[PDB]
Design a protein around this motif. Structure first.
Motif, PDB file in Angstrom:
ATOM      1  N   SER A   1       0.814  -1.209   0.000  1.00  0.00           N
ATOM      2  CA  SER A   1       0.000   0.000   0.000  1.00  0.00           C
ATOM      3  C   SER A   1       0.853   1.266   0.000  1.00  0.00           C
ATOM      4  CB  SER A   1      -0.958   0.024   1.193  1.00  0.00           C
ATOM      5  OG  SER A   1      -1.622  -1.214   1.371  1.00  0.00           O
ATOM      6  N   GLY A   2       0.201   2.369  -0.293  1.00  0.00           N
ATOM      7  CA  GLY A   2       0.853   3.659  -0.354  1.00  0.00           C
ATOM      8  C   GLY A   2       1.008   4.064  -1.799  1.00  0.00           C
ATOM      9  N   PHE A   3       1.014   5.365  -2.033  1.00  0.00           N
ATOM     10  CA  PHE A   3       1.153   5.895  -3.375  1.00  0.00           C
ATOM     11  C   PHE A   3       1.942   7.169  -3.291  1.00  0.00           C
ATOM     12  CE2 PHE A   3      -0.103   7.448  -7.586  1.00  0.00           C
ATOM     13  CZ  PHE A   3       0.080   6.287  -8.303  1.00  0.00           C
ATOM     14  N   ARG A   4       3.133   7.133  -3.843  1.00  0.00           N
ATOM     15  CA  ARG A   4       4.038   8.253  -3.804  1.00  0.00           C
ATOM     16  C   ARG A   4       4.361   8.720  -5.198  1.00  0.00           C
ATOM     17  NH1 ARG A   4       5.539  11.377   0.524  1.00  0.00           N
ATOM     18  NH2 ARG A   4       5.550  10.105   2.438  1.00  0.00           N
ATOM     19  N   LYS A   5       4.786   9.977  -5.321  1.00  0.00           N
ATOM     20  CA  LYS A   5       5.339  10.514  -6.551  1.00  0.00           C
ATOM     21  C   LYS A   5       6.734   9.878  -6.600  1.00  0.00           C
ATOM     22  CE  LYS A   5       3.496  13.344  -8.688  1.00  0.00           C
ATOM     23  NZ  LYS A   5       3.846  14.750  -8.381  1.00  0.00           N
ATOM     24  N   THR A 280      -9.719  14.745   1.327  1.00  0.00           N
ATOM     25  CA  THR A 280      -8.495  14.596   0.546  1.00  0.00           C
ATOM     26  C   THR A 280      -8.533  13.268  -0.223  1.00  0.00           C
ATOM     27  OG1 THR A 280      -7.317  13.599   2.386  1.00  0.00           O
ATOM     28  CG2 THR A 280      -7.087  16.012   2.134  1.00  0.00           C
ATOM     29  N   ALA A 285      -5.365  17.698  -1.432  1.00  0.00           N
ATOM     30  CA  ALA A 285      -6.599  18.495  -1.530  1.00  0.00           C
ATOM     31  C   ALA A 285      -6.815  19.029  -2.971  1.00  0.00           C
ATOM     32  CB  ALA A 285      -6.580  19.655  -0.545  1.00  0.00           C
ATOM     33  N   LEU A 286      -5.875  18.762  -3.875  1.00  0.00           N
ATOM     34  CA  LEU A 286      -5.956  19.124  -5.278  1.00  0.00           C
ATOM     35  C   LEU A 286      -6.001  17.816  -6.084  1.00  0.00           C
ATOM     36  CD1 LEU A 286      -3.187  21.861  -5.641  1.00  0.00           C
ATOM     37  CD2 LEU A 286      -5.664  22.183  -5.367  1.00  0.00           C
ATOM     38  N   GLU A 290       0.078  14.521 -12.371  1.00  0.00           N
ATOM     39  CA  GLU A 290       1.417  14.165 -12.835  1.00  0.00           C
ATOM     40  C   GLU A 290       1.729  12.662 -12.604  1.00  0.00           C
ATOM     41  OE1 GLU A 290       4.483  17.190 -12.300  1.00  0.00           O
ATOM     42  OE2 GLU A 290       3.252  18.632 -13.430  1.00  0.00           O
TER      43      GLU A 290
ATOM     44  N   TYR B 126      11.617   7.607  -3.987  1.00  0.00           N
ATOM     45  CA  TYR B 126      10.744   8.661  -3.504  1.00  0.00           C
ATOM     46  C   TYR B 126      11.226   9.188  -2.197  1.00  0.00           C
ATOM     47  CZ  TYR B 126       8.594   4.740  -0.996  1.00  0.00           C
ATOM     48  OH  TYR B 126       8.375   3.649  -0.204  1.00  0.00           O
ATOM     49  N   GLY B 138       4.959   5.134   3.188  1.00  0.00           N
ATOM     50  CA  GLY B 138       5.678   4.715   1.990  1.00  0.00           C
ATOM     51  C   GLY B 138       4.781   4.202   0.897  1.00  0.00           C
ATOM     52  N   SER B 139       5.395   3.613  -0.098  1.00  0.00           N
ATOM     53  CA  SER B 139       4.716   2.973  -1.200  1.00  0.00           C
ATOM     54  C   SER B 139       5.439   1.656  -1.316  1.00  0.00           C
ATOM     55  CB  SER B 139       4.859   3.790  -2.480  1.00  0.00           C
ATOM     56  OG  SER B 139       4.334   3.032  -3.559  1.00  0.00           O
ATOM     57  N   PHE B 140       4.870   0.621  -0.707  1.00  0.00           N
ATOM     58  CA  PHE B 140       5.523  -0.666  -0.636  1.00  0.00           C
ATOM     59  C   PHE B 140       4.528  -1.767  -0.853  1.00  0.00           C
ATOM     60  CE2 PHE B 140       8.380   1.549   2.602  1.00  0.00           C
ATOM     61  CZ  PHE B 140       9.559   1.374   1.932  1.00  0.00           C
ATOM     62  N   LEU B 141       4.812  -2.657  -1.778  1.00  0.00           N
ATOM     63  CA  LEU B 141       3.974  -3.818  -2.024  1.00  0.00           C
ATOM     64  C   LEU B 141       4.639  -5.032  -1.354  1.00  0.00           C
ATOM     65  CD1 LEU B 141       3.381  -3.234  -5.837  1.00  0.00           C
ATOM     66  CD2 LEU B 141       1.828  -2.696  -3.993  1.00  0.00           C
ATOM     67  N   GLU B 166       4.150  -3.580   6.998  1.00  0.00           N
ATOM     68  CA  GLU B 166       3.079  -2.672   6.663  1.00  0.00           C
ATOM     69  C   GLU B 166       2.015  -2.858   7.737  1.00  0.00           C
ATOM     70  OE1 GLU B 166       1.681  -1.668   2.675  1.00  0.00           O
ATOM     71  OE2 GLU B 166      -0.309  -2.342   3.335  1.00  0.00           O
ATOM     72  N   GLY B 170      -2.042   0.871   6.313  1.00  0.00           N
ATOM     73  CA  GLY B 170      -1.298   1.067   5.079  1.00  0.00           C
ATOM     74  C   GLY B 170      -0.018   1.867   5.230  1.00  0.00           C
ATOM     75  N   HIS B 172       3.982   2.289   7.096  1.00  0.00           N
ATOM     76  CA  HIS B 172       5.075   1.343   7.164  1.00  0.00           C
ATOM     77  C   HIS B 172       5.984   1.490   8.349  1.00  0.00           C
ATOM     78  CE1 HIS B 172       3.651   1.731   3.009  1.00  0.00           C
ATOM     79  NE2 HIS B 172       3.554   0.411   3.164  1.00  0.00           N
ATOM     80  N   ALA B 285      -2.395  22.628  -1.795  1.00  0.00           N
ATOM     81  CA  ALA B 285      -3.553  23.173  -1.080  1.00  0.00           C
ATOM     82  C   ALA B 285      -3.559  22.753   0.412  1.00  0.00           C
ATOM     83  CB  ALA B 285      -4.850  22.750  -1.749  1.00  0.00           C
ATOM     84  N   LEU B 286      -2.591  21.936   0.833  1.00  0.00           N
ATOM     85  CA  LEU B 286      -2.393  21.482   2.206  1.00  0.00           C
ATOM     86  C   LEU B 286      -1.030  21.980   2.678  1.00  0.00           C
ATOM     87  CD1 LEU B 286      -3.628  17.777   2.188  1.00  0.00           C
ATOM     88  CD2 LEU B 286      -4.850  19.778   2.926  1.00  0.00           C
TER      89      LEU B 286
END
Ligand SMILES: CO[C@@]1(C(=O)Nc2cncc3ccccc23)CCOc2ccc(Cl)cc21
Ligand SMILES: CO[C@@]1(C(=O)Nc2cncc3ccccc23)CCOc2ccc(Cl)cc21
Lengths: 305, 300
Positions: A1-5, A280, A285-286, A290, B126, B138-141, B166, B170, B172, B285-286
């Motif tokens: 899980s997680g989603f990063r740029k 969010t 919040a946007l 990208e 990242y 994080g973003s870890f599978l 994890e 969700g 880490h 915006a945050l």
């Protein structure tokens, strides 16, 4: 899980970064095989930049006027030529760290990783998109020219961007590795501006699919829309038109989450017309534009290089 | 100009990533000199995870039970030992790509780059921050265990994190490279939860200074605050307390922009009260809390 740029691992590109000095100016070069690529403006003084005749400025330079440094080793320049807005310095040593590579020109909406460099030394890596107005919202200080953008597709580095300029609004302009600018920009110190930009609709949809995959569903609704009605709303909110190609590209994400592309469009339409209501999506919040559909699939599937 | 969430170039760490297999389990290892570091849970089956006795599980393993693959080359394990929650596999080849490195244990609020890996192969890079509750967002599978976090200030790689787990929300949890977990977490499948997370106040202030350096001032106001009144307000929005250490650390940014730290605190109090009113700060915006004062100075 997680989603990063997330950027591509930069190691394959780090081994190509060199320092190029011409007179008082020092910037970055990309050393691939026996050629070092860099912005042709490295040969200009500030006065030359006002109205440069690059062919005339270059004919006055000799190979020894270009100092190329790869780490702590000075490379010898044995030839020089220009291709569009890029200068190609032939060197006497092929880069032993040259990865499998290609030069590709990307379209607006496509994302890539930027390896920001100063004095031929990589400083940081970040992910960005080629905006619909052909600028990039990068992070570049003086000395960053010649830093490159790239993607990796399997074991092949596709170089797509070389940094040349910062516009007055703080956004950036550059070329592909064949020296052709993205956008209506020129390598001259004359009044230039970023045009009005728009949001990359297909990427916002991809990011909404990423949010659903990560457990964020509050924005989903029972509604669907036609592609034409959605595009009327997209035009109103300065979003790029969504084409049938974009709908097809989102097919895999639509099948995985069970939310049809036009069903996700109706969620986006409601978000555009009503906002997020204090909520969010993936910590934002946007509406984020990208991440491409391919970036979302790659990050949610764990593709390696 | 511009301000991006920026990771360190990952090349120095990519050349250290290896695949570690123990029985049916495969995860990532960090190969530095002649040692491969990886989560000790690599020796566990899915069943062993509830109450593993790692000393007992490890004593039953021999060097040939650990398969280490560096690219398409199998490394030979010639020794194995455990240090806290990390397993150290001695190999017969020193990594020729070993950079100048150190192991550093970081504090909450500190940022670092993560090189996410699967099967010993880097997938992406990242930027993260160690949250006040000792987790990282994080973003870890599955298969990402053993991926590391690092900083590279001045050619030396400071490894600060190794991924282990994890949590149900969700987020880490992991250890430093000495195998000590960050936070009250343990490498077992017993019920564990992230504590209530809070905002890293000093980092939000640093990011507001980044916004002023980049030309934005709309959020500034004519007010100042005491440190105690700021903390009383900030706590009501789940912000971490701002200490005198944080005020001192913001000194250089305060001197550069001409905005006293307590004057910037008054802007932050107003932002918490008003929101952004449809405006953005550095494209957000945050209020962003994953840039430290050091990151802002480095980037701006
Ligand atoms: C070559 O220098 C220029 C430039 O934009 N450079 C920069 C590029 N990135 C970040 C910058 C941050 C701060 C200062 C300059 C930056 C400035 C002068 O006029 C021009 C005109 C055209 C071109 Cl193609 C470049 C240039
Ligand atoms: C050993 O793996 C566990 C784990 O969290 N792994 C993962 C780590 N990262 C991302 C993950 C994404 C999806 C699935 C698992 C992930 C799961 C079982 O219980 C536990 C218990 C303790 C520990 Cl130290 C690890 C683990």
């Amino acid at each position: 899980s997680g989603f990063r740029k997330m950027a591509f691992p930069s190691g394959k590109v780090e081994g190509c970064m060199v320092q190029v000095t011409c007179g008082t100016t020092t910037l970055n070069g990309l050393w691939l095989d026996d050629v070092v690529y860099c912005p042709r403006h490295v040969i200009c003084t500030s006065e030359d930049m006002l109205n440069p005749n690059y062919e005339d400025l270059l004919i006055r330079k000799s190979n020894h006027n270009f100092l190329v440094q790869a780490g702590n080793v000075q490379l010898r320049v044995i030839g020089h030529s220009m291709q569009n807005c890029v200068l190609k310095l032939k060197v006497d040593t092929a880069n032993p760290k040259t990865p499998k590579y290609k030069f590709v020109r990307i379209q607006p909406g496509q994302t890539f990783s930027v390896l920001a460099c100063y004095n031929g030394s990589p400083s940081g890596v970040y992910q960005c998109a080629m905006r619909p107005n052909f600028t990039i919202k990068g992070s570049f200080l003086n000395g960053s020219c010649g830093s490159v953008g790239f993607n990796i597709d399997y074991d092949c580095v596709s170089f797509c961007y070389m940094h040349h300029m910062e516009l007055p609004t703080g956004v950036h302009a550059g070329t592909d590795l064949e020296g052709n600018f993205y956008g209506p920009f020129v390598d001259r110190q004359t009044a230039q501006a970023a045009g009005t930009d728009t949001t990359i609709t297909v990427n916002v949809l991809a990011w909404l699919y990423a949010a659903v995959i990560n457990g964020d569903r509050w924005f989903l609704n029972r509604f669907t829309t036609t592609l034409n009605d959605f595009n009327l709303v997209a035009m109103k909110y300065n979003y790029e038109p969504l084409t049938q190609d974009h709908v097809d590209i989102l097919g895999p994400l639509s099948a995985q989450t069970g939310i049809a592309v036009l069903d996700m469009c109706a969620s986006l339409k409601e978000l555009l017309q009503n906002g997020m209501n204090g909520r969010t999506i993936l910590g934002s919040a946007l509406l984020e534009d990208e991440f491409t559909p391919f970036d979302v699939v790659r990050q949610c599937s764990g593709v390696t290089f």
